[PDB]
Ligand SMILES: [Ca+2]
Ligand SMILES: [Ca+2]
């Protein structure tokens with residue numbers, strides 16, 4: 001460990017009424033172990049604290065002792081991941097939580113079993129809580145991960161692939177590598193496969209000195225791993241960006257002698273955001289459980305544009321999902 005982790009614990013405010021059960025379930029320990037498995041980096045220590053005034057189905061995450069997000073988890077119910085309105089036709093009244101324009105639908109255990117037979121996918125409450133936390137923690141990676149962690153990882157790798165590390169370091173500094181890794185994690189891409197990441201840096205770093213651009217190439221190299229992560233072991237649920245919207249973005253792109261950036265009139269960008277908002281508004285699958293699909297040329301710009309309003313909606317390129325299996329496009333923007 002380094003200071004990055006060691007000096008800055010995460011705090012979960014939980015209901016007093018659930019504390020003992022969350023201890024028994026080893027919430028804190030399992031969050032830490034699973035996150036490491038899933039993303040390849042270590043979280044800080046996780047402290048539980050009883051939260052004043054919390055109902056029985058609420059959790060708050062504090063980073064740096066500051067409230068970051070409040071989650072609703074129906075501990076005694078089941079979440080319907082691929083909900084549709086058809087469910088109400090069957091005489092089920094779900095329990096519904098909304099955060100922004102994302103909606104979450106919960107049913108009884110008995111109702112769940114019924115729904116499964118009709119091909120709905122269910123998630124248990126602790127599994128949902130872990131997903132919520134993980135998504136939010138990935139985004140906030142810079143709070144607990146940096147050069148010290150990167151250097152450790154490089155050192156571990158070196159012990160195994162010395163010549164590979166040698167080559168990479170000739171073309172990228174530790175700082176630059178750390179930046180690449182943070183940018184991957186912040187977009188929910190795992191860094192567990194360090195060997196592959198390093199092979200891609202050895203290929204690309206000699207030639208690409210702009211960090212944003214470099215990251216895009218690395219993502220490309222890692223395509224299989226990105227896809228497998230997002231899709232889990234299930235179908236990939238997606239919203240497609242229309243050729244129309246792609247073009248608005250494309251026209252706004254300016255190439256320089258340095259970085260490539262998006263340059264849209266503020267009114268124009270606001271109007272485009274209003275359109276994206278409108279198209280997303282009536283979705284019944286939560287944003288963290290979706291991806292937006294677009295062309296490689298516009299992917300990173302679309303991500304930057306929407307992340308203010310829609311922080312939990314990741315954006316993949318068509319190439320990134322080349323190894324996909326079942327894909328379900330639920331909507332076009
Ligand atoms: Ca119900
Ligand atoms: Ca407006």
Ligand SMILES: [Hg+2]
Nearest residue numbers: 078109110112
């Ligand atoms: Hg169940």
Ligand SMILES: [Hg+2]
Nearest residue numbers: 071131132133
């Ligand atoms: Hg969530």
Ligand SMILES: [Hg+2]
Nearest residue numbers: 227228323324
């Ligand atoms: Hg995949």
